[PDB]
RNA sequence: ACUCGGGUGGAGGCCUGUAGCGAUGCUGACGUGCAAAUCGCUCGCAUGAUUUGGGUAUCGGAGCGAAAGACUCAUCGAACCACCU
RNA sequence: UGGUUGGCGUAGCAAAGAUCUAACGGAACGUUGGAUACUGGAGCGGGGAAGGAUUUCGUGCCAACGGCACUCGUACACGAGUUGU
RNA sequence: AAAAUAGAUGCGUAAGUUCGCAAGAAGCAUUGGCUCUGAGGGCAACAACUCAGAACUGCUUACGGCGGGGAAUCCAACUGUAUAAU
RNA sequence: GGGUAAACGGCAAGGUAGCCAAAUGCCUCGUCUUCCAAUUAGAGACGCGCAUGAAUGGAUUAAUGAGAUUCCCUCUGUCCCGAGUU
RNA sequence: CGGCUCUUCCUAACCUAGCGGCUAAGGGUUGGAUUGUUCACCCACUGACAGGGAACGUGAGCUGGGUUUAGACCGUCGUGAGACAGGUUGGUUUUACCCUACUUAGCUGGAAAUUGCGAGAAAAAAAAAAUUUUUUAAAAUUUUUUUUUUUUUUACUUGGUACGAAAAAAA
RNA sequence: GGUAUCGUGAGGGUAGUACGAGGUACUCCCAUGCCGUGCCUCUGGUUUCUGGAGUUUGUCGAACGGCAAGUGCUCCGACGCUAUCGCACGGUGGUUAGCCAGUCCCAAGACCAGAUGCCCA
RNA sequence: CACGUCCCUCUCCAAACGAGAGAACAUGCAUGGGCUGGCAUGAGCGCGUGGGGCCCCGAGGCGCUGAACCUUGAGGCCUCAUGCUGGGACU
């Protein structure tokens, strides 16, 4: 559902992913219809064009995709349960949405795990 | 270029000329229906939330409890005090006339005064002595002939019973009078509902029912001479801006050589009339004395009351019938909000949904309020020094 | 309107206006006191009084001056000043060296120590080869027993 | 052969920073102002080619200038006063 | 050149934190007491230069002036006042 | 523009360099309260108040005041002066 | 007639050492490389230099700079996108 | 100049919609790196990133980056002072309290739109109930009788009003 | 003629939009974005309740209690305000997507012989 | 002069001021209580670094003590309890 937008373009979310990316730099949010001055903003479950800013050089200087799997910006469940994370990290992923890592680090959000069938499986936990 | 800031059909944004939130248009009359009243004045109390099991094929929440906010609207029965007929004319509806009830509660006659108690209190005094006489009974009889004949619209003139509201904060004692249209069957049928119901109370539960929606109309909360940034939502200017930030930088051009009605300007925001649609009725609620275990759902059995522990802030206990409807309702707490039968088609999959509440909330509004019950709070803290300094006194007596 | 006497009382009470006290209850008798000599009569006569200066106690400080002696309020968070501002190196060196030059000078005077070794130590005292008095106090002892053996 | 410790000492158109002298930025306040140039914070120098009182010397086709045609009594790419006019 | 005008009882009189109380005074702001703050020794402190030149002081006054008010004033009026081997 | 750095102590401190510097480079670190201890002198035959240490204990990280830093290029070597009023 | 360019100046002589799209390069946002997701910017190279160049000083320079300029870390209401309080 | 801000209008329609290129101005038409820019080009998103007008919309709205006077530097030109639409750097952005527009906010008049008495109704053309018939003060201005309301002694949300009764007053 | 009340509604404003998924290639669903109209239960922000606590220096002889530091500073903090940072809602009919009407907003200078209550010396 | 409106006064769903909504002897206002919340365990007396000569000094700690205080005020709740209760203008 609605997930209050957390990670505007320019954000540097961490890479939770198995890969050698250390952190992602959000470049733009896929599916972002734009109002005028508004910055595109990734939120939980969103695919994101992101360049690794730190980590293995092979990943370092190309735009990459990444779904956001956790988020310090808290959001409200339809269940009425506002919730949030210690950190907001994403995982690198294909345009298809298959994830390129072999295993996600920390907890993955419930609506990361539900949009992304593969992300859900590698997730150590769902939240 | 970006879209316009603000809806131009809500304009002028001026103070409403009333506060009672009168219905602008009643839903279209349907002869096939049996006669009924189309609206009901109610007093906004406060909000809570409820848990509910959405059971809506599709979505990620079907079969899953969801916390909806609800507004509670205390609804003491309105009293009908007169009928009104309208006749269609090429220039538009004209009142045929009205038949007042043989008797009128003082709260109603308070309404015709600015200072009732220092008045001679003569309102409806000639009617009272004339409706009694056969001369005035035949005259009242003729008005109904005119309704059954020339009318297209029958309307009850109902009012709120503030005496019965017993709210300590809604300071009014003038009754909130208002015509409430009778959509229904043939005009004789509407007259008949109208006159049998011509001095009786009218509970909401007759006009409405649960899970059905209601359009609301109430003046929205007043904000005074609001500025353009709060009034229209325009972007405030960059810090470096000189004359001031909170302005529309360009309120016009060379031509047309004047400010247009469309550029945003500082002025009254709030306290505008609004008709908001499709507010689902999560529960009609009977008066606390009659049905004390309000807010006690099938899945939450503790005897309980719709009013929070601190009472509603600024309003207090809901001592009466209450409509509990989903989401926000325009207007401040304790404003009187007319709420009509829906004018929308109401055949939506959502609107038709039955709403079985799983948990009315009753925690304090005031602080966070982690207790649903005054009994449960005591069941947490247990006895404490206010009691020991109380219990000891009782033993001494 | 006895603003003149208050000018006068303040002068002959040898204080400020702030301290002089013209009795509120007898403005009239004060009121006809045109001369300093009139006002002096009013001062002995009690219509005019000098109030004690408003107190400024040091009791909070003396109690602090106890605690500071016992080492309270001393540590890293309680130090604005550089260790040199807070206690100068030149101040310590003088005290250290005035003390050494004096003890070398006391022994030379009682000739506990040779007028020879005095240069031997007067000049080492200046190169702080001696941390303290009792460092030099024992060096004079051990620079001397080395001689006692022979 | 004259180097490595450690102290000493208090140097410098040295540093941080008061006072004082300035006056960068906000292109902030003000902008028919408190002010015919001010206010605020910020900032620069602050042992020096420093700042400062008094006195004294040098001026109008002239004086004086670490030089901007700057300043020479709110007047300067030629002061001000009167006069020719 | 003089006078008058609309704007207009308007724009403003918003820099430096502040007064409160009782009693008295008075025709109605001052005075005293108390309270309360402030300045905060590079001071709304105490003395001087330059400059000013009666502003000093007392009594009275408050017409005008003290951009509100004044019963108060650096204002007005009257009387005083500055002492050296 | 704001924020930010910030005092002291102990560590640690790069390039480049005219060998002076750069440098407070940078960068971590500890800091309260309390009850104690140690050190550091004078005059004969009592005086400081800094440093140091130790336990115990506390933190809501809680006055004021107090550098943000680094890597480079252009220009001028430096301090200075200077268009009072862009 | 002679001498003189740390005279004015040129490059009678034909721009040497250097240095550059430099505050000096029109063409031009030059080209290459480096920086970014992307760079008319920057740095570094290159040099058909419209029109660089030697006390009209050339180049290079540590320290200095309320100088110009680029980026970085930190930081933040600059911003997303405004809200609340005084 | 530009931007920002805000509104608005156009269409030789970019997307959306309907068709089969046509109609269609409705609503929408992104976020960034470089550069003052516009523009262009790029990166990313996007359903798409269309083109324009509004005094090349919009400075008593701002910003002041461009242009940018005096200061200064460089190149070239000039014997020189100085010039260059060449580059570089530094370079006060004033006033609404008027009128109107507008935005809210009030007050008061007014229909021969303030007057005339100058007269127009989206009215009706003995009354009510089931066009015609029946019912609603009577008997000799006053008196009597009847009906309705107010005061006192079950059904309505449940304090206060209705009908109950009985008496008094009015028609 | 006052005063009051309920309404009428000429006229004017006017708004919803887009995307995606499902389901089966329309219907029908289900979310979201934008827009818009609100609202403040929750969640976040906001504190001059200077609420409560802690705390620093000065100060009140001290404890207590304060007080000054132009709200001293730190923590928590109700009311309230507010955020697509929370939440609710965004409807039809008729004509040729338009357009008009409606719903929606202002609505008698559109001067409403509309109704109505009261008094009309 | 009628009815009444308005002012003054009180309240606030209103509010720049007008306007608005209300009140008009009314739990209206006021305190108090109860409550709902907040904070977080008051004052005061009665385990402990060590220290001084069985007590004293001792930050901190414990106990009474979810205590103390605050809780409607630009305007939380409760009638729970007590307290206090028209003039002018206009036609
Ligand atoms: Mg500005
Ligand atoms: Mg609440
Ligand atoms: Mg120096
Ligand atoms: Mg400096
Ligand atoms: Mg010049
Ligand atoms: Mg004024
Ligand atoms: Mg002070
Ligand atoms: Mg005098
Ligand atoms: Mg005089
Ligand atoms: Mg800055
Ligand atoms: Mg080195
Ligand atoms: Mg220089
Ligand atoms: Mg200047
Ligand atoms: Mg280069
Ligand atoms: Mg040259
Ligand atoms: Mg300098
Ligand atoms: Mg233009
Ligand atoms: Mg203009
Ligand atoms: Mg007339
Ligand atoms: Mg009150």
Please give the structure tokens belonging to residue B22. Answer: 């009168």
Please give the structure tokens belonging to residue B194. Answer: 């109208």
> Which positions in chain B touch A80 (Cβ < 8 Å)?
49, 51, 66-67
Cβ under 8 Å to A: B residues 30-69: 49, 51, 54, 60-61, 64-67
Q: Cβ distance B155 to B83 under 8 Å?
A: yes
Cβ of B292: how many Cβ atoms within 10 Å?
12
The CA distances from residue B198 to A81, B106, B191, B207, B218, in Å, are 49, 16, 10, 15, 25
| Closest residue, chain A, to B234 (C-alpha) | A37
Please give the structure tokens belonging to residue A4. Answer: 């209050």
Residue B331 to residue B316: CA distance in whole angstroms: 17
Nearest to B298 by CA among B354, B353, B360: B360
**Resolution of the entry in angstroms:** 2.5
Nearest to B282 by CA among B315, B306, B308: B306
Cβ of B29: how many Cβ atoms within 10 Å?
19
Nearest to B166 by CA among B49, B307, B23: B307
Nearest to A79 among B1, B65, B235 (CB): B65
Cis geometry, peptide bond prior to residue B12 (ω within 30 degrees of 0): yes
CB < 8 Å & 24+ apart, contacts of A73-78: A73/A4, A73/A5, A73/A6, A73/A7, A73/A43, A74/A4, A75/A2, A75/A3, A75/A4, A75/A6, A75/A43, A75/A44, A76/A2, A76/A4, A77/A1, A78/A1, A78/B54, A78/B60, A78/B61, A78/B64, A78/B66, A78/B67
Q: Cβ distance C21 to C48 under 8 Å?
A: yes
Residue A68 to residue A63: CA distance in whole angstroms: 15
Please give the structure tokens belonging to residue C2. Answer: 């006895």
* DSSP 8-class letter at C78: G
Length B368 CA → G2 C1' (Å): 110
List all chains that touch chain A, counting a touch as 3 or more CB pairs closer than 8 Å.
Answer: B
Count of all residues that appear for chain A in the document: 127
> Which positions in chain B touch A79 (Cβ < 8 Å)?
61, 64-67
Three-class DSSP category at C44: helix
Length B332 CA → J70 C1' (Å): 27
Question: Phi/psi of residue A9, each to 5°?
Answer: -55, 135
Nearest to B42 by CA among B120, B158, B191: B158
> What is the 3 state secondary structure string of chain C?
CCHHHHHHHHHHCCCCCCCEEECHHHHHHHHCCCCHHHHHHHHHCCCEEECCCCCCCCHHHHHHHHHHHCCCCCCHHHCCCCHHHHCCHHHHHHHHHHHHHHHHHHHHHHCCCCHHHHHHHHHHHCCCCCCCHHHHHHHHHHCCHHHHCC
Nearest to B61 among A36, A37, A78 (CB): A78
- List, in sequence order, every residue forming a beta bridge with B84; answer none if it has no partner: B98, B155
3-state percent helix, strand, coil for chain A, nearest multiple of 5: 10, 35, 55
Cβ of B345 near strand I (under 7 Å)? The reply is yes
Do B66 and A35 count as a contact with CB atoms less than 8 A apart? no
Cβ of C75: how many Cβ atoms within 10 Å?
8
DSSP string, B148-161: HHH-SEEEEEEE--
Technique used: cryo-EM
Residue A70 to residue A63: CA distance in whole angstroms: 20
Query: On chain G, which bases lie within 7 A of the protein's CB atoms?
Result: 36-38, 77-84
Classify residue A63 by burial, with Cβ atoms within 10 Å: 0-12, 13-18, 19+: exposed
Please give the structure tokens belonging to residue C17. Answer: 């206006």
Q: Cβ distance A12 to A25 under 8 Å?
A: yes
Distance between alpha carbon B345 and the CA centroid of its chain, in Å?
A: 21
* DSSP 8-class letter at A2: -
Three-class DSSP category at A52: strand
Nearest to B48 by CA among B293, B357, B374, B290: B357
Residue B266 to residue B271: CA distance in whole angstroms: 15
Please give the structure tokens belonging to residue C94. Answer: 């003088």
From the candidates A76, A80, A126, which should be mutated to test the interface with B, based on the most B CB atoms within 10 A?
A: A80
3-state percent helix, strand, coil for chain C, nearest multiple of 5: 60, 5, 35
Nearest to B197 by CA among B216, B185, B209, B180: B180
Q: How far is the CA of C92 from the centre of ligand 3 (A)?
A: 28
Cβ of B223 near strand J (under 7 Å)? The reply is yes
**DSSP H stretches of helix in chain B:** 106-109, 125-130, 134-150, 162-165, 187-196, 204-207, 228-231, 374-381, 385-396
Cβ of B178 near strand I (under 7 Å)? The reply is yes
Classify residue B146 by burial, with Cβ atoms within 10 Å: 0-12, 13-18, 19+: middle
Residue B296 to residue B357: CA distance in whole angstroms: 9
Nearest to A79 among B2, B66, B235 (CB): B66
Please give the structure tokens belonging to residue B109. Answer: 């006659």
């Amino acid at each position: 559902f609605r997930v209050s937008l957390a990670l505007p373009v320019g954000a540097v979310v961490n890479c939770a992913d198995n890969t050698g990316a250390k952190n992602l730099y959000i470049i733009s949010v896929k599916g972002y219809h734009g109002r005028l001055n508004r910055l595109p903003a990734a939120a939980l479950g969103d695919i994101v064009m992101a360049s690794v800013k730190k980590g293995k050089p092979e990943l370092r200087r190309k735009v990459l995709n990444a779904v956001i799997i956790r988020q310090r910006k808290s959001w409200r469940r339809k269940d009425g349960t506002v919730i949030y994370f210690e950190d907001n990290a994403g995982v690198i992923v294909n345009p298809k949405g298959e994830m390129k890592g072999s295993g996600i680090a920390g907890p993955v959000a419930k609506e990361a795990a539900d949009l992304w069938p593969k992300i859900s499986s590698h997730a150590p936990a769902i939240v | 270029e970006h879209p316009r800031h603000g809806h131009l059909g809500f304009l002028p944004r001026k103070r409403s000329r009333q506060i009672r939130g009168r219905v602008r248009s009643f839903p279209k009359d349907d002869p096939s229906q049996k006669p009924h009243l189309t609206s009901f004045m109610v007093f906004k109390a406060g909000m809570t939330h409820i848990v509910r099991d959405v059971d809506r094929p599709g979505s990620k929440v079907n079969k899953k409890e969801v916390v909806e906010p609800v507004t509670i609207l205390e609804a003491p029965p309105m009293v009908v005090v007169g009928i009104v007929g309208y006749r269609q004319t090429p220039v538009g509806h004209k009142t045929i006339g009205t038949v007042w009830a043989h008797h009128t509660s003082v709260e109603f006659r308070r309404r015709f005064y600015k200072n009732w108690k220092q008045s001679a209190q003569l309102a409806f005094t000639k009617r009272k002595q004339f409706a009694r006489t056969t001369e005035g009974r035949l005259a009242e009889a003729r008005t109904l002939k005119a309704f059954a004949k020339k009318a297209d619209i029958i309307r009850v003139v109902a009012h709120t019973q503030l005496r019965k509201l017993r709210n300590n904060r809604v300071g009014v004692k003038k009754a909130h009078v208002s015509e409430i249209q009778i959509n229904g069957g043939t005009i004789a049928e509407k007259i008949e509902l109208a006159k049998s119901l011509l001095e009786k109370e009218v509970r909401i539960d007759s006009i409405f029912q649960q899970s059905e929606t209601c359009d609301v109309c109430a003046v929205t909360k007043g904000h005074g001479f609001t500025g353009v940034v709060k009034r229209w939502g325009v972007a405030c200017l960059p810090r470096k801006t000189h004359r001031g930030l909170r302005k529309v930088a360009c309120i016009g051009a060379w031509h047309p050589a004047r400010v247009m009605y469309t550029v945003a300007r500082a002025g009254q925001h709030g306290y505008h009339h609004r008709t908001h649609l499709n507010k689902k009725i999560y529960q009609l609620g009977r008066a606390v004395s009659m049905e004390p275990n309000q807010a006690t759902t099938t899945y939450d059995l503790t005897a309980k009351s719709i009013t929070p522990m601190g009472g509603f802030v600024g309003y207090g206990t809901v001592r009466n019938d209450y409509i509990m409807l989903k989401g926000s309702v325009a207007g401040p707490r304790r404003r009187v909000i007319t709420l009509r039968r829906p004018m929308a088609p109401q055949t939506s999959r959502k609107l038709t949904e039955q709403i079985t509440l799983k948990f009315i909330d009753t925690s304090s509004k005031i602080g966070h309020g982690r207790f649903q019950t005054k009994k449960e709070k005591s069941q947490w803290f247990g006895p404490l020094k206010k009691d020991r300094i109380r219990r000891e006194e009782r033993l001494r007596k | 309107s006895l603003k003149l006497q208050a000018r006068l009382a303040a002068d002959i009470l040898r204080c400020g206006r702030h301290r002089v006290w013209l009795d509120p209850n007898e403005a009239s008798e004060i009121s006809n006191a045109n001369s300093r000599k009139s006002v002096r009569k009013l001062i002995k006569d009690g219509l005019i009084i000098r109030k004690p200066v408003k107190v400024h106690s040091r009791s909070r400080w003396r109690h602090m001056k106890e605690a500071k002696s016992m080492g309270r309020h001393e540590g890293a968070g309680r130090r604005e000043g550089t260790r040199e501002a807070r206690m100068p190196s030149k101040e310590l060196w003088m005290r250290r060296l005035r003390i050494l030059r004096r003890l070398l000078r006391k022994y030379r005077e009682e000739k506990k120590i040779d007028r020879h070794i005095y240069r031997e130590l007067y000049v080492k005292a200046k190169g702080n080869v001696f941390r303290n008095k009792r460092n030099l106090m024992e060096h004079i002892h051990k620079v001397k027993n080395e001689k006692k053996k022979e």
